Amino acid sequence: SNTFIPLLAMILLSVSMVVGLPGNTFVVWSILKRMRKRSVTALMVLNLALADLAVLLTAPFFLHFLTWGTWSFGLAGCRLCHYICGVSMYASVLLITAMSLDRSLAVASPFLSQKVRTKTAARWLLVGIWGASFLLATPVLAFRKVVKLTNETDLCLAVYPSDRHKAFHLLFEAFTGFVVPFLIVVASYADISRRLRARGSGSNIFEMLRIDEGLRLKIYKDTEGYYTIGIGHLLTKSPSLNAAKSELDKAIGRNTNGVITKDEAEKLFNQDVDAAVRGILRNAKLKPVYDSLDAVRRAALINMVFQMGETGVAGFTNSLRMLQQKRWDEAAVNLAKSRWYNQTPNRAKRVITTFRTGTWDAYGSGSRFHRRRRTGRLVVIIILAFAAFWLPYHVVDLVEGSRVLAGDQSKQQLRNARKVCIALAFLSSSVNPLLYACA
Numbered sequence: 001s002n003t004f005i006p007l008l009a010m011i012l013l014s015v016s017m018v019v020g021l022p023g024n025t026f027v028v029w030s031i032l033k034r035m036r037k038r039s040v041t042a043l044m045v046l047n048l049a050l051a052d053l054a055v056l057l058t059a060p061f062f063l064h065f066l067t068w069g070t071w072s073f074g075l076a077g078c079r080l081c082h083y084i085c086g087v088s089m090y091a092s093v094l095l096i097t098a099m100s101l102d103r104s105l106a107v108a109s110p111f112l113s114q115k116v117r118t119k120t121a122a123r124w125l126l127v128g129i130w131g132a133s134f135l136l137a138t139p140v141l142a143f144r145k146v147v148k149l150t151n152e153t154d155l156c157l158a159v160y161p162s163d164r165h166k167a168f169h170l171l172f173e174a175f176t177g178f179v180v181p182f183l184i185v186v187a188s189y190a191d192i193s194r195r196l197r198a199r200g201s202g203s204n205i206f207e208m209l210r211i212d213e214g215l216r217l218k219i220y221k222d223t224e225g226y227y228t229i230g231i232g233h234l235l236t237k238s239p240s241l242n243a244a245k246s247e248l249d250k251a252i253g254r255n256t257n258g259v260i261t262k263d264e265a266e267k268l269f270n271q272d273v274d275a276a277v278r279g280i281l282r283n284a285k286l287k288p289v290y291d292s293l294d295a296v297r298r299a300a301l302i303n304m305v306f307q308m309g310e311t312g313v314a315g316f317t318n319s320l321r322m323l324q325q326k327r328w329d330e331a332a333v334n335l336a337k338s339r340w341y342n343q344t345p346n347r348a349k350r351v352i353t354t355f356r357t358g359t360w361d362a363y364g365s366g367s368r369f370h371r372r373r374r375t376g377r378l379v380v381i382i383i384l385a386f387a388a389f390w391l392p393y394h395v396v397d398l399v400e401g402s403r404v405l406a407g408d409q410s411k412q413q414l415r416n417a418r419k420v421c422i423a424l425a426f427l428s429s430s431v432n433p434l435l436y437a438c439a
């Protein structure tokens, strides 16, 4: 088994050359030669597919070192190749953090993105990522030097003066390289999938509310004589129009002069359910029942809460728990005697109908189907191919530093096992062009 690990590491590094060199050289080409307005999503890809190219430029050296038997490029060679390799890991993973940290701001509030996602404020970030990536790989050029092993064989690897030195740096490139990003991209990218559960899949929750609360695209006066716009979005508790009108422009970022788009009315409505669902989940009485209700019957809890406020809908306890206990017919007929049913029966006869049937049958037929998922669905695979390629390597870094404080011959497998994990990761630089050729 002494011969097959070098055999495995020399094909992957060569298939990464035959696939990663041409693809990245093309991907980096189009974004420069054949484009006028380079989108922000075309710069992330650019630098990410630009950095991935530099790592592969060092591959012909490790392959030579893999077969020749000794290093051949002097202190600079092995001081450099690891620095170039160490900077792409850092640059690549931070770009993937930013890309993933951003698709959580495009759903948290899509009106701030227009005022924050500026090509001038994206380019002036890349330098930051690059600069803050050029620095975090600096220990690798201080600790990796060539040592003459035999008259005819000088090997190169990290020379750590003490094992405490080795430990922390092996841990240091794990938290910062992977664990800090893996934790960040898990908070942001799971906040989203936990945000949409309130917002409901597709636009289905919106059109339901349009029929009910009325869709108006200009500032008007509410039922109680107060300024609102859209589906009940309260602009301000204030009398003045210019105060009310200006208050809106702050939350949209553009000079509306009193008018918003069908889109702007919908995004703004999501903030009206996003913030109306925390009130539910932070409410003593309607949190438990809501958690039990399926995706369909949830929007109607969001509907009544939109209607009368949580403090008000919290009153129908006996009709509340009957839902929680999954008995609809005894909650459908029980809600029939409320003043809410009497004062407004066109919207009560259908909200209640969505409970006992658990479908959108009472509201519409075939005008709600959308593909809410955006191009970030592609952005969510280039992080997984990345994570699946870089976890094998880092667990060893994580296990060496951990097991270098207590306890050779049992650990003689790690470097033999690290060799492939370290060499497997040479394919992540060659994974974007196939994902772009996935279509």
Ligand SMILES: CC(C)(c1ccc(O)cc1)c1ccc(OCc2cccc(COc3ccc(C(=N)N)cc3)c2)cc1
Residues within 6 Å of the ligand: 006, 009, 051, 052, 053, 055, 062, 063, 065, 066, 081, 082, 085, 086, 088, 089, 092, 393, 419, 422, 423, 425, 426, 427, 428, 429
């Ligand atoms: C496998 C080989 C040739 C060897 C040699 C002697 C032997 O007996 C057995 C094996 C070897 C030697 C040294 C070595 O250290 C460099 C290294 C180690 C892990 C990782 C990277 C960067 O990878 C990246 C960085 C960034 C990206 C990116 N997406 N932008 C992709 C891949 C560099 C690596 C391999």
